[PDB]
Amino acid sequence: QPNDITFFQRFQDDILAGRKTITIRDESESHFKTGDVLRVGRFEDDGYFCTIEVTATSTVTLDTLTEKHAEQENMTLTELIKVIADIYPGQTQFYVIEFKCL
Numbered sequence: 465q466p467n468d469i470t471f472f473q474r475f476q477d478d479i480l481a482g483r484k485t486i487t488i489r490d491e492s493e494s495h496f497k498t499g500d501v502l503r504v505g506r507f508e509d510d511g512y513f514c515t516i517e518v519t520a521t522s523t524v525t526l527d528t529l530t531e532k533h534a535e536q537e538n539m540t541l542t543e544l545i546k547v548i549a550d551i552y553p554g555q556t557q558f559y560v561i562e563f564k565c566l
C-alpha cells in the first residue's frame with residue numbers, strides 16, 4: 465500500500481498530535497477532495513505514518529492566506545509564507561486540504 469501524499473517529517477508529530485489540520489499545496493495536489501482517505505508518508509523516506517481523511521478543501525492565493533491558515537498549519541503567518549516561498553518558489557495559486565488523522 466503506497467502513500468498518496470507526503471509531508472516533511474518535521475511535521476509528523478504535529479500531524480499525529482492534531483496540531484496541524486490543514487496543508488497548503490499547489491496544483492499538483494489539487495485532485496484530493498473531501499471524503500478521500502489517504503495514506504501519508506514522510507517526504508524524506510516515504511515511510512508511512514498515518515492515514516488521513518480529507519474533511520474540506522478550498523482554493524487560496526498567496527495574498528489571501530490568513531492567520532487562521534497559519535494556525536491550522538501550526539505556524540505563524542510569517543513562517544507559513546517563508547515555507548511557501550521555498551517549497552513553491554514564484555507561485556501564487558494554492559489549494560487547501562483540511563484533514564484529520566484516523
Ligand SMILES: Nc1ccn([C@@H]2O[C@H](CO)[C@@H](O)[C@H]2O)c(=O)n1
Nearest residue numbers: 470471472475487488489507551
Ligand atoms: N504545506 C506543505 C507543502 C508541501 N509539503 C511537502 O513538500 C513536498 C513538496 O511540495 C510535499 O510532497 C510535502 O512532502 C509539506 O510538508 N507541507
Ligand SMILES: [Mg+2]
Nearest residue numbers: 546547549550
Ligand atoms: Mg526559507
